[PDB]
Design a protein around this ligand. Structure first.
Ligand SMILES: C[C@@]1(N2CCN(c3cc4cc(NC(=O)[C@H]5CC56CCOCC6)ncc4cc3Cl)CC2)COC[C@@H]1O
Length: 258
């Protein structure tokens, strides 16, 4: 029925491949996973999703120990491939992608879902350059019956993880996703990641906490988006800006063209 044409990327459990229909020539993205409690969780979350800034999930087929997850093929590819190394991208394009990222994250948080691994590799683009949050393999429920549950599991990607995840036994889900969006914004505006990890043993992170914004990547960033990044990349998650307040930010609301 299908045929694995090209590899689109690889995760912890399974691989994502470009599948072209043997009859219709319809090209889709298929996540092929071998072997359980996590794929049942992932399928459950994928069926809950319905938003313009979240990848479309078609369905799932099981073949013994093999699990197939059918998803929307994003023709524009990844946000990662739009970032020019050491440069980034034009500020109006970065603003628009950030507005769309916030829209997708507000939606997820609104249904009580935390993504837990936001990065340019899983932010995909459709034919009209609309951003779509993909890869729900680490996603979990942080709110149910209007009651918040604290996270305790270590997961994500070190340059994108919030510092409380490395320090605290339990932490709130929403500030962790806000933090990763901040690193994505830095990547879009500088074409460079600021640190290997947000720990005191990492010089670049110590430099940021000491406000050495005359250093890269910060010196490449204009004063307005840099003021926003100062509010996002705050060590104490209880003092960190929330998405309702990000929506009131000067740069977030700055009219930009071309
Ligand atoms: C594990 C990681 N990844 C794996 C790939 N993955 C997906 C990749 C997809 C990729 C695409 N579309 C394309 O690649 C566009 C460019 C073309 C043009 C058309 O032809 C085909 C290639 N569409 C849908 C996808 C759906 C998903 Cl879910 C996201 C998660 C995250 O961290 C490291 C890895 O990158």
């Amino acid at each position: 029925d299908w045929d694995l044409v090209q590899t689109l990327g690889e995760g912890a459990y399974g691989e994502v491949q470009l599948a072209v229909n043997r009859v219709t020539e319809e090209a889709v993205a298929v996540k092929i996973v071998d072997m359980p409690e996590n794929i049942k969780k992932e399928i459950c979350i994928l069926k809950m999703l319905n938003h313009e800034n979240v990848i479309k999930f078609y369905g799932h087929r099981r073949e013994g120990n093999i699990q197939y997850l059918f998803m929307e093929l994003a023709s524009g590819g990844s946000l990662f491939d739009r970032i020019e190394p050491d440069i980034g991208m034009p500020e109006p394009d970065a603003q628009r992608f950030f507005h769309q990222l916030m829209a997708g994250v507000v939606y997820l948080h609104g249904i009580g879902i935390t993504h837990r691994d936001i990065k340019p590799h899983n932010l995909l683009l459709d034919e009209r350059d609309n951003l779509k949050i993909a890869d729900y393999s680490l996603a979990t429920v942080f709110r149910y019956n209007n009651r918040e549950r604290l996270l305790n599991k270590m997961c994500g990607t070190l340059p994108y993880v919030a510092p409380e995840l490395l320090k605290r036994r339990e932490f709130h889900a929403e500030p962790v996703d806000v933090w990763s969006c901040g690193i994505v914004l830095t990547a879009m505006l500088a074409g460079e990641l600021p640190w290997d990890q947000p720990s005191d043993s990492c010089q670049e992170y110590s430099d940021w906490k000491e406000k050495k914004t005359y250093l890269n990547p910060w010196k490449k960033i204009d004063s307005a988006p840099l003021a926003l990044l100062h509010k996002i990349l705050v060590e104490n998650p209880s003092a960190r800006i929330t998405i309702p307040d990000i929506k009131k930010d000067r740069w977030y609301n700055k009219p930009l063209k071309k």
